[PDB]
Nucleic acid binder design. Structure first.
Length: 141
RNA sequence: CUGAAAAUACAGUGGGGCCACUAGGGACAGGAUUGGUGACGUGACCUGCCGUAUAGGCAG
């Protein structure tokens, strides 16, 4: 699964019709987040889900925050955001309601967010998830 | 399978001549628009060379 996801990162710049900060995640990686088995049960994460996210944590690690956009500025939708947090979709809308998670362009007053349109950056959606500590994080070892 | 079928309105043409709207004339007095407001930092326009030159030319 790592080597399958490694070629998509190396050949990310090849596929670009627009800039990284304007392109969606499913345009480069393709369905690999919303196909993943859900963690609605117990808050017990799937071994497929543990392996996917732990690759994305080292992606933003290798792609620091510079003035040129890179692979860590790909746009993520509210459903793909809901899976990466492992919570309900209303709970992730409520974080948007109290401006905890910051969209990536301003909707103009009658814009209610399309649930499939890529709203948030991959970047700080991960950093929000690393603000919550669970036992098998890479920080301790 | 119709108040059923069918159907060539046509040819020609001189509105013309004349004409005084005119005289007179006060729109005028009064007037409080007012309170309150962040254009940008997910962005390409960089790094150097020649030249006396904020002239003018150039390399990725």
């Amino acid at each position: 699964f790592n080597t399958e996801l490694d070629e998509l990162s190396k050949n990310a710049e090849m596929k670009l019709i627009d800039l990284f900060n304007k392109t969606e995640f499913k345009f480069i990686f393709g369905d690999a987040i919303l196909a993943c088995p859900s963690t609605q049960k117990q808050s017990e994460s799937h071994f497929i889900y543990r392996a996917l996210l732990d690759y994305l944590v080292t992606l933003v690690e290798s792609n620091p925050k510079t003035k040129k956009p890179n692979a860590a500025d790909l746009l993520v939708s509210v459903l793909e955001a809901a899976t990466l947090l492992g919570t309900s979709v209303e709970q992730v809308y409520r974080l948007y309601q109290n401006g905890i998670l910051q969209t990536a362009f301003r909707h103009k007053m009658n814009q209610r967010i399309n649930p499939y349109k890529g709203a948030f950056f991959l970047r700080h959606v991960i950093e929000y998830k690393t603000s919550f500590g669970n036992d098998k994080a890479r920080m301790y070892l």
